[PDB]
Design a binder for this molecule. Structure first.
Ligand code: J6Q
Length: 290
């Protein structure tokens, strides 16, 4: 039928309500129904053809509000619907999906940096807390491989982190994994084939263009080719077995650049520009809308 890359929210001068879909098959962008509430620092994901937007923060002239919200976008209707809210607001959140369930990981609520993690069940419209991570992480990368959830990098309130850890659902327990070779907060983190990728991010001084990947069989991290643009607070998704990175911040500009990674050639190329530069978007892939 055809799959699109949906980018929801983000930040340019203030938090944004935009939802836009990119079609790699033809290069087009579609503006769709705005989020009910502007938000940056959110995550996107998909379950059962439905797009969800999780956490973030509304940075606005009228005040600044960390989000506990879960909202659901149905491509068939072009309408956003509220779901049950999380236990707590989570700006600069990471999310992963296991077996139709959404895990919300870390993020901030004011000066609070969460190590807490909670899981959403669409069939019940219900969040429940699970075991907290071993580390407080905001700007955290989250991915799922072989039905295990990984929390990668971030900021713990004092240091940006090269550490990463793994949640084993049937044990309801987090264990540390090999740290990355690079301190990265607000990196893009995703899975492709057997590896967990961490692209770009922030280390307290610089925005990064480097990219490394974790092979679960070998438990080691290896650098691949770097992105064309240094970027923090980027969005990342996979589409037809290629990585796409969307927007972010390079120390200078809120990027409109979109790049994709070809694992076979180990090369990055510009694939498009977003309609406008922005950081802290939520990205996920699903069906084209009615
Ligand atoms: C908005 C955002 C910020 C972050 C992190 C937080 C931190 O690690 O403190 C950050 C902060 C400040 C940054 C930066 C990145 N990149 N450049 N600058 C100045 C990570 C993810 C997201 Cl969605």
């Amino acid at each position: 039928v055809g799959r699109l890359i949906y980018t929801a929210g983000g930040y340019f001068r203030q938090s944004l309500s935009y939802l836009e879909a990119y079609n790699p098959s033809n290069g087009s962008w579609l503006r769709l129904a705005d989020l009910q509430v502007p938000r940056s620092g959110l995550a996107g994901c998909v379950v059962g053809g439905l797009l969800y937007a999780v956490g973030g923060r509304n940075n606005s002239p009228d005040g600044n509000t960390d989000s506990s919200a879960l909202d659901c976008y149905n491509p068939m209707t072009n309408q956003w619907s509220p779901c049950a809210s999380m236990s707590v607001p989570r700006n600069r959140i990471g999310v992963g999906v296991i077996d139709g369930h959404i895990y919300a990981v870390g993020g901030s609520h004011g000066c609070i940096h969460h190590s807490s993690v909670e899981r959403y069940e669409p069939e019940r419209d219900e969040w429940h807390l699970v075991a907290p991570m071993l580390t407080r992480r905001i700007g955290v990368g989250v991915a799922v491989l072989n039905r295990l959830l990984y929390a990668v990098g971030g900021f713990d309130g004092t240091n940006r982190l090269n550490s990463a850890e793994c949640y084993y659902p049937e044990r309801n327990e987090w264990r540390m994994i090999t740290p990355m070779n690079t301190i990265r907060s607000g990196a893009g983190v995703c899975v492709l084939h057997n590896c967990i990728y961490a692209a770009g991010g922030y280390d307290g001084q610089d925005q990064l263009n480097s990219v490394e990947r974790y092979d679960v069989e070998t438990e080691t991290w290896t650098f691949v080719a770097p992105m064309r643009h240094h970027r923090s607070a980027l969005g990342i998704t996979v589409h037809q077995g290629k990585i796409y990175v969307l927007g972010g911040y390079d120390g200078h500009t809120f990027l409109d650049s979109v790049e994709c990674y070809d694992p076979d050639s180990d090369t990055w190329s510009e694939v498009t520009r977003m309609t406008s530069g922005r950081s802290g978007v939520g990205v996920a892939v699903t069906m084209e809308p009615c």
